[PDB]
Design a binder for this molecule. Structure first.
Ligand SMILES: OC[C@H]1O[C@@H](O)[C@@H](O)[C@@H](O)[C@@H]1O
Ligand SMILES: OC[C@H]1O[C@@H](O)[C@@H](O)[C@@H](O)[C@@H]1O
Ligand SMILES: OC[C@H]1O[C@@H](O)[C@@H](O)[C@@H](O)[C@@H]1O
Ligand SMILES: OC[C@H]1O[C@@H](O)[C@@H](O)[C@@H](O)[C@@H]1O
Ligand SMILES: OC[C@H]1O[C@H](O)[C@@H](O)[C@@H](O)[C@@H]1O
Ligand SMILES: OC[C@H]1O[C@H](O)[C@@H](O)[C@@H](O)[C@@H]1O
Ligand SMILES: OC[C@H]1O[C@H](O)[C@@H](O)[C@@H](O)[C@@H]1O
Ligand SMILES: OC[C@H]1O[C@H](O)[C@@H](O)[C@@H](O)[C@@H]1O
Ligand SMILES: OC[C@H]1O[C@H](O)[C@@H](O)[C@@H](O)[C@@H]1O
Ligand SMILES: OC[C@H]1O[C@H](O)[C@@H](O)[C@@H](O)[C@@H]1O
Ligand SMILES: OC[C@H]1O[C@H](O)[C@@H](O)[C@@H](O)[C@@H]1O
Ligand SMILES: OC[C@H]1O[C@H](O)[C@@H](O)[C@@H](O)[C@@H]1O
Ligand SMILES: OC[C@H]1O[C@H](O)[C@@H](O)[C@@H](O)[C@@H]1O
Ligand SMILES: OC[C@H]1O[C@H](O)[C@@H](O)[C@@H](O)[C@@H]1O
Lengths: 106, 109, 109, 106
């Protein structure tokens, strides 16, 4: 993985890997960005044992984490209406949600 | 590779590969999108004698092609404005360009 | 749906349905064939910690189950080489893969 | 419908469908493929009043169109030995026959 396409997601354990940096949806609903092994960013919604979480980039541009019972845990709050967006784990360590198709090769 | 952050580009012979699909700046200045081994899209800039071209994504969102010192042969025309763009060769095939950051963690190095 | 033309794919939570039969790709990587409610065939992959898999009909004739950005969980082993194949969930229940084209009206679009 | 298995067929008026695509065995005895109302392919064996025809996919892998009695009018001539086959009307507007089976679950 490296980029999550429109309406794609990460289940518990799955992650976005690029160099020592890794964005992961942990065993507890906590999304973290690690530099090697040091946590540098997290959604801070961690609750030991609370598994079955999903992190999915919705079509409206919102990035939401969901509880096993489909409830919202945390949301990026981008939601710029319907379109085509992508979340990329950049090599410079940043996580960016670039939105709205500007061009396409058909 | 697989992506192109604005200001990054493909030189005379480099590619972006998402397995069946391919995007390569061949040696004849022609930038084409293959499917396995079947041309599906083209820049149409393989002028005879011309060589050493480059595909370049930019800050203004324009995906341009160039030859000997500047001079654009082709240029998508997706010049939306100065921002942050990326050209990605998707899993489905379609080569898309995404317009400016909507949200980030601002955790750059 | 009841068919997969060559390089198609059954993604997490998707199925092929015909009469009371159903070849559904469950949440867990288990590919199962039911008779409305009873399981009558299985890939056998209800693996703990394996969510979101995909069953896809390969171009080489092989039908395999893939992990989330993973590998071969299951395989029909029906590898016969590259051509055109198809998997169908028939009304007699039997799910079959048919080896390459013999005749076509050549009416592609 | 959209598939014809070993020894299945179309009687005068029957057809396979999938979106605006239509493979039909008309009362003219002419097998035709229609995009909407526009014809696209045909056997060109039509005769007004020539009804009672049946198109049948066979074990030898042959798609034969038969007369009201029981004689050959047209045939794909895809005879490639006894086996199992299918004729599908694909979502791309093409009609193909597939050589035998290579894998089945039951
Ligand atoms: O149209 C695409 C086609 O153009 C030709 O001129 C060559 O450059 C080929 O390599 C390429 O596949
Ligand atoms: O986590 C991505 C990136 O975040 C910034 O804060 C950097 O200073 C490092 O901590 C790291 O490389
Ligand atoms: O044998 C089939 C059977 O396998 C179990 O492990 C579960 O996945 C059930 O949902 C399924 O019906
Ligand atoms: O060649 C057959 C094919 O031709 C296309 O032009 C369309 O008419 C389709 O509806 C049809 O399936
Ligand atoms: O903030 C980083 C830290 O946050 C929580 O404590 C947990 O999710 C840990 O696994 C993680 O290392
Ligand atoms: O906070 C989560 C919530 O945020 C916004 O309201 C929307 O994007 C919803 O789709 C999402 O579930
Ligand atoms: O045209 C842009 C749009 O095209 C297709 O729908 C897909 O490739 C989308 O992922 C992409 O954003
Ligand atoms: O503000 C978003 C912007 O932040 C930093 O400048 C970089 O990570 C860019 O790639 C990103 O687009
Ligand atoms: O049309 C080509 C032309 O388009 C815009 O003006 C810019 O992207 C220029 O850099 C480029 O040369
Ligand atoms: O192990 C299953 C294996 O079967 C065949 O070799 C191919 O379809 C491979 O792609 C697949 O991985
Ligand atoms: O030659 C038969 C072949 O024709 C085209 O390639 C496509 O419509 C395929 O689906 C089909 O199997
Ligand atoms: O040849 C195609 C043409 O054949 C006959 O004329 C008729 O059955 C028409 O409906 C059909 O379109
Ligand atoms: O040419 C028509 C003829 O072809 C083959 O011989 C067989 O399929 C026969 O059944 C059929 O009558
Ligand atoms: O799988 C081969 C063969 O098996 C059974 O005989 C039936 O289900 C046929 O429809 C199928 O073609």
């Amino acid at each position: 993985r490296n980029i999550l396409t429109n309406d794609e997601g990460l289940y518990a354990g799955q992650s976005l890997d690029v160099n020592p940096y890794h964005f992961i949806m942990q065993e507890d609903c906590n999304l973290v960005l690690y530099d090697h092994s040091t946590s540098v960013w997290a959604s801070n919604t961690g609750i030991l044992g609370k598994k079955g979480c999903k992190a999915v980039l919705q079509a409206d541009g919102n990035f939401v984490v969901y509880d096993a019972e489909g409830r919202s845990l945390w949301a990026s709050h981008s939601v710029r209406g319907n379109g085509n967006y992508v979340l990329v784990l950049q090599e410079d360590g940043n996580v960016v949600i670039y939105g709205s198709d500007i061009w396409s090769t058909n």
